[PDB]
Amino acid sequence: GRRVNVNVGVLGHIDSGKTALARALSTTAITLDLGFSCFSVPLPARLRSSPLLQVTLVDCPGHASLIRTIIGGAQIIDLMMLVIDVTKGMQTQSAECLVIGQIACQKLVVVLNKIDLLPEGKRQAAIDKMTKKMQKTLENTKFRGAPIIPVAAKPGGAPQGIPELIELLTSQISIPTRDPSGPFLMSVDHCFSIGTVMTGTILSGSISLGDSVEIPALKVVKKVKSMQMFHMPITSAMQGDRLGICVTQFDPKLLERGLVCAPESLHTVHAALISVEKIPYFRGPLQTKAKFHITVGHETVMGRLMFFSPAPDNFDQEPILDSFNFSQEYLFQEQYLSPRQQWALVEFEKPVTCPRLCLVIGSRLDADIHTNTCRLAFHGILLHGLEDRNYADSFLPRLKVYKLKHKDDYSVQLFVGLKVHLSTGELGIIDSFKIHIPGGLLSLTFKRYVFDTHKRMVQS
Ligand SMILES: Nc1nc2c(ncn2[C@@H]2O[C@H](COP(=O)(O)OP(=O)(O)NP(=O)(O)O)[C@@H](O)[C@H]2O)c(=O)[nH]1
């Protein structure tokens, strides 16, 4: 019968049960990169506004040096189930995976794994102790009271609590505005040749048979032949679905993971004007001109930044994260002021192709794998992306950020005219280090990028 695919993701620390829990699910129904499986339960009544539900279990690596795999693979998922070793506490990458889930998941389900690894007598009041504690950490977040089930996939190296798990799952899972509205975009999980195949997940818009599909790292753009999904050929598919796509002949090595868009939808940004909200759990400073690891899409590149804030006189300005208004002014600042809204401008090393208005996560991933504190610095919408390559001249001169810089009678290069104050209640103006004075006896605003045609010092 007819079906719906929905991507539940399994995220957690290393050796928390993810792969071991994804099996337990798929059956009663390591890990160096995203791995997909799928169980089915009869489709809930509520979901017919689109009979079987098919949960696709996106399995994620735990290894801290593979965070970028997660960040990408959390955009593929609707509901994220955070699996936590119950014996060990809430570990490091776990409390990172919670951040990622906040940034990119709509709903959450905490799982307490390794139940058996506990004193059968005290078995409960520990769960109820780990449960009560989990409530507390989640309190601060948008997943205020997400479910917290205890299970055990491998009672050693039959699994408990798993049938209970799926019914809690087949209830919290929630499909968004499943619009095959906008420009089509697909994350490709596996791509191989037989034609050439692309088992990927759709993110935006629809795609009918024989449509026009661009592959950017492939340098050309083939047309869709067949579309096998639920073991049976389809004539059209849209968001949320996991799909299979046969396109013109080509080779795979030209991609292994990445993006498949509409004919022209995607950018090729060299830099971008981005909404930047800082992540609280990140201890430390976000420093204007500091090269962070930056994840934009199923792609993650190196970028130095520069932060700023709305006018001083217009801080308390609503927070708009849909477009940028290049009319207003913005005071250039040295670090993320910790300004209802604060922006920044990332200038990459290599370029980064991205769907317009995609989320961005700045992070410092040169750190140890056994790191001490969260490594995810800031997230934030990509408010605008400079497509131009020589953009610093071509387009930035359209932004108005400046650095409030500060430093015989009636007459004590490019400052020859600016009214300067002196300490005794006087005016004064530069001239020929001579200074003509009104009557008888600097606070300029250099635009950050105006020199290109103005090198201004014009202050009022
Ligand atoms: N005691 C106990 N051990 C379990 C249970 N479930 C899984 N394990 C143990 O967890 C160990 C590592 O977990 P595993 O699922 O392999 O790793 P993972 O969840 O995929 N994370 P990663 O991707 O880094 O391997 C396994 O060797 C398995 O024996 C459980 O329910 N109880």
The CA distance from 105 to 324, in Å, is 25
Tell me if 173 sits within 8 A of 8, measured CB to CB. yes
Q: What residue has token string 């990172």?
A: 96
Which residue CA neighbors atom 13 of ligand 1 most closely? 15
Query: Which secondary structure element, helix H or strand E, spans residue 27, and what is its range?
Result: helix 18-27
Largest CA distance in the chain: 99
Q: Closest by alpha carbon to 185, among 155, 157, 211, 159?
A: 211
Q: Specify whether the backbone of 418 is left (phi greater than 0), alpha (psi in -120 to 50) or beta.
A: beta
The CA distance from 146 to 135, in Å, is 8
3-state secondary structure 409-422: CCECCCCCCCECCE
Q: Is 19 annotated as a binding residue?
A: yes
Rounded to the nearest angstrom, the distance between the alpha carbon of 134 and the centre of ligand 1 is 21
Kindly give the number of the ligand 1 atom that is closest to the alpha carbon of 16: 19
The CA distance from 281 to 3, in Å, is 40
Q: Is 17 annotated as a binding residue?
A: yes
Q: Which of 154, 160, 165, 369 to mutate to test the pocket of ligand 1 (most atoms within 8 A of CB)?
A: 154
One-letter amino acid at 297 equals G
DSSP state of 150: E
Taking residue 162's Cβ as centre, other Cβ atoms within 10 Å add up to 19
Q: Quick one: how far is CA 300 from the chain centroid? A: 10
Is any ligand 1 atom within 6 A of the Cβ of residue 18?
yes
| Residues after which a C–N gap over 2.5 Å breaks the chain | 29, 50, 157, 194, 338, 407, 412, 432, 441
Alpha helices in 311-361 (DSSP H): none
Q: Which of 19, 21, 81, 86 to mutate to test the pocket of ligand 1 (most atoms within 8 A of CB)?
A: 19
Q: What residue has token string 């209802």?
A: 340
Is any ligand 1 atom within 6 A of the Cβ of residue 155?
yes
How was this model experimentally determined? Answer: X-ray
Is any ligand 1 atom within 6 A of the Cβ of residue 31?
yes
Terminal Cα distance for the chain, rounded: 72
One-letter amino acid at 426 equals E
Kindly give the number of the ligand 1 atom that is closest to the alpha carbon of 153: 31
Q: Residue 386: beta bridge partners? A: 271
Helix (H, G, I), strand (E, B) or coil at 171: helix
List phi, psi (to 5°) of 70.
-60, -65
The CA distance from 189 to 33, in Å, is 10
The DSSP code sequence of 177-199 is: -----S--EEEEEEEEE--EEEE
The DSSP code sequence of 441-459 is: ------BTT-TTTT-----
Kindly give the number of the ligand 1 atom that is closest to the alpha carbon of 63: 24
The CA distance from 242 to 142, in Å, is 27
Kindly give the number of the ligand 1 atom that is closest to the alpha carbon of 24: 6
Alpha carbon of 372 to those of 95, 149, 166, 455: distances in Å?
12, 28, 34, 45
One-letter amino acid at 40 equals S
Residues in the chain: 460
Q: Residue 242: beta bridge partners? A: 201
Spell out where 318-358 has E strands: 330-332, 343-352
Rounded to the nearest angstrom, the distance between the alpha carbon of 20 and the centre of ligand 1 is 5
Rounded to the nearest angstrom, the distance between the alpha carbon of 157 and the centre of ligand 1 is 7
Is any ligand 1 atom within 6 A of the Cβ of residue 63?
yes
Could you tell me the two tokens for 443? 């606070």
Is any ligand 1 atom within 6 A of the Cβ of residue 62?
yes
Tell me if 4 sits within 8 A of 43, measured CB to CB. yes
Q: Is 154 annotated as a binding residue?
A: yes
Kindly give the number of the ligand 1 atom that is closest to the alpha carbon of 87: 1
- CA dihedral defined by 281, 282, 287, 292, rounded to 10 degrees? -130
For 45, residues 6+ apart whose C-beta sits below 8 A from its C-beta are none
One-letter amino acid at 177 equals T
For 140, residues 6+ apart whose C-beta sits below 8 A from its C-beta are none
Alpha carbon of 41 to those of 56, 148, 163, 219, 347: distances in Å?
11, 21, 11, 41, 47
Tell me if 50 sits within 8 A of 178, measured CB to CB. yes
